[PDB]
């Protein structure tokens, strides 16, 4: 019933990792296509002339596996909106390189972060790749409900956290997404990978995402609570958000390390299955309308036409 993926930033052996992940019950793996620490130079000598293979071979997996089991991830050092001209230029070239490799591999989806207000140049480079060749792949913009700056621990003496309500301010990450997709002119290949935090924001921040193309929901292991038996569970408010996301048929992504160490890893995914099974059964109307959700139809005209 529930389609779920594993998010990793460390894949020492591609074949061994995929096997371990499939055994755990996951349907897909979000992983780096180039080593996340392998910063590359395109303009200055001698580093621009770095030899050897720039990454792992496409021969490591079958075409079917690349097409169905792997979601690419943009390298964390790629900063197209950097204040430094040199980083901006190397990042544009690296972003185009990584997106082109993803398309070369036939990846079903590719993850890109929205982790600051200004992603103008990231949108420009993405729009340019979209208007270049094969138009099938999906781009999942990784955006949090609550920005890291707004959920940081109140531990900086000379920089206290804001304890005042900032109605529009707490909705900031939606404006990051909105501006990005406006720039990319509402491409249908650009969707949201919504990242959920340990503490949920006010309902108005959550509802801001209603009507948005959410294709995935990212659940860090650190947001999970522990029950009397020692197994990962979620707060009632988190469960309420999972139920809403299940109606949108999002793919769930489990990120981070095992924090329930003496309770195995598939337990996180077993809990999502539990929530999925323990939901209200659809009524006569809901069972009838299944398949027609957001399906645009021409209104019948029984006068002008013979039904």
């Amino acid at each position: 019933r529930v389609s779920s993926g594993r998010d990793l930033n460390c894949v020492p052996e591609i074949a061994d990792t995929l096997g371990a992940v499939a055994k755990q019950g996951f349907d897909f793996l979000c992983m780096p296509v180039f080593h996340p620490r392998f910063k590359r130079e395109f303009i200055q000598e001698p580093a621009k002339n770095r030899p050897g293979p720039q990454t792992r071979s496409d021969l490591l997996l079958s075409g079917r596996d690349w097409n169905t089991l792997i979601v690419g991830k943009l390298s964390p050092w790629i900063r197209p909106d950097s204040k430094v001209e040199k980083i901006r230029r190397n990042s544009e070239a690296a972003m185009l390189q990584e997106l082109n490799f993803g398309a070369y591999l036939g990846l079903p989806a590719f993850l890109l972060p929205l982790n600051q207000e200004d992603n103008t140049n990231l949108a420009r480079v993405l729009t340019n790749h979209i208007h270049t060749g094969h138009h099938s792949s999906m781009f999942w913009m990784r955006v949090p409900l609550v920005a890291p700056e707004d959920l940081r621990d109140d531990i900086i003496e000379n920089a206290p956290t804001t304890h005042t309500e900032e109605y529009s301010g707490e909705e900031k990450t939606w404006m990051w997404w909105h501006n990005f997709r406006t720039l990319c002119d509402y491409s249908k290949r650009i969707a949201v990978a919504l990242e959920i935090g340990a503490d949920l924001p006010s309902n108005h921040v959550i509802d801001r995402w209603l009507g948005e193309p959410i294709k995935a929901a990212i659940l860090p292991t650190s947001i999970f609570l522990t029950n009397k038996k020692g197994f990962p569970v979620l707060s009632k408010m988190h469960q309420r958000l999972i139920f809403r996301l299940l109606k949108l048929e999002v793919q769930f992504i489990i990120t981070g390390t095992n924090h329930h160490s003496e309770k195995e890893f598939c337990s996180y995914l077993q809990y999502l299955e539990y929530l999925s099974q323990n939901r209200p059964p659809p009524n006569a109307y809901e069972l009838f309308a299944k398949g027609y959700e957001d399906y645009l139809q021409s209104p019948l005209q029984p006068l002008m036409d013979n039904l």
Binding site: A289, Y295, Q297, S298, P299, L300
Partner: peptide
Amino acid sequence: SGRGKGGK
């Protein structure tokens, strides 16, 4: 269904 036709 629901008073509509066409689509895909």
